[PDB]
């Protein structure tokens, strides 16, 4: 569903449908990417929807090597970052910059890898600052502690790579695919952190 269709629905219709966790799709626009005028814009309605949650795990067999394996999601939805706001600068030569400032920039998640082991983490991109070409822009971000200091029993950084795929110069509305790798939950120091690789789609309205 595009942004107009999403905004055309009342709250009652959306409730219970799972649409609230989705991300707007850019049906219009062009894939040339040369119609994006150079300059700086205020990025608003920056939304992100993952599609896979592969996690790096050591092979159980002695002769095997660490590999990224698929997982099964536990938390019902509640894994989509939305309402993010920041700044987006695109150069005439082809260079570009992306930065996130505020919004819902984190979401706690728990995924079970095959064998029964469930690992939690905090999917976030907060304080992102990426610089590079339109395709292949890369940056890093901070990952807060999974739980606060008030938690009782009974900083970290992660990289990311965005890439704009479609642009709609008349109304902005840039869409693309992203990939990122972030450390797992490291609370209580009971186990070493693990690496989660997340791929997905990203939409933004830079006007």
């Amino acid at each position: 569903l595009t942004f107009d269709e999403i905004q055309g629905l009342t709250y009652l219709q959306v409730k219970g449908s799972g649409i609230a966790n989705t991300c707007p799709v850019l049906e219009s626009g062009t894939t040339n990417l040369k119609e994006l005028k150079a300059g700086s814009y205020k990025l608003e309605n920056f939304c992100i929807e993952p599609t896979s949650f592969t996690v790096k795990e050591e092979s159980q067999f002695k002769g095997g090597e660490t590999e990224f394996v698929k997982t099964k999601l536990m938390t019902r939805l509640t894994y989509t970052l939305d309402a993010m706001s920041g700044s987006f600068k695109v150069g005439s030569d082809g260079s570009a910059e992306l930065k996130e400032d505020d919004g819902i920039d984190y979401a706690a998640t728990t995924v079970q890898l095959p064998g029964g082991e469930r690992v939690a983490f905090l999917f976030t991109i907060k304080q992102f600052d990426g610089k590079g070409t339109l395709d292949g822009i890369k940056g890093d971000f901070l990952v807060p502690s999974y739980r606060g200091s008030s938690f009782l029993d009974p900083a970290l950084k992660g990289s990311a790579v965005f890439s704009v795929a479609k642009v709609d110069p008349v109304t902005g509305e840039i869409a693309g695919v992203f990939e990122s790798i972030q450390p797992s939950d490291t609370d209580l120091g009971a186990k070493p952190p693990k690496d989660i690789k997340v791929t997905g789609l990203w939409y933004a309205q830079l006007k």
């Binding site: 099964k72 999601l73 536990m74 019902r76 728990t110 079970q112 469930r118």
Partner: peptide, 10 residues
């Protein structure tokens, strides 16, 4: 539930 393990977890 999306998966049986999710049903167990919740």
């Amino acid at each position: 539930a999306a998966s049986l393990d999710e049903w167990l977890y919740n």
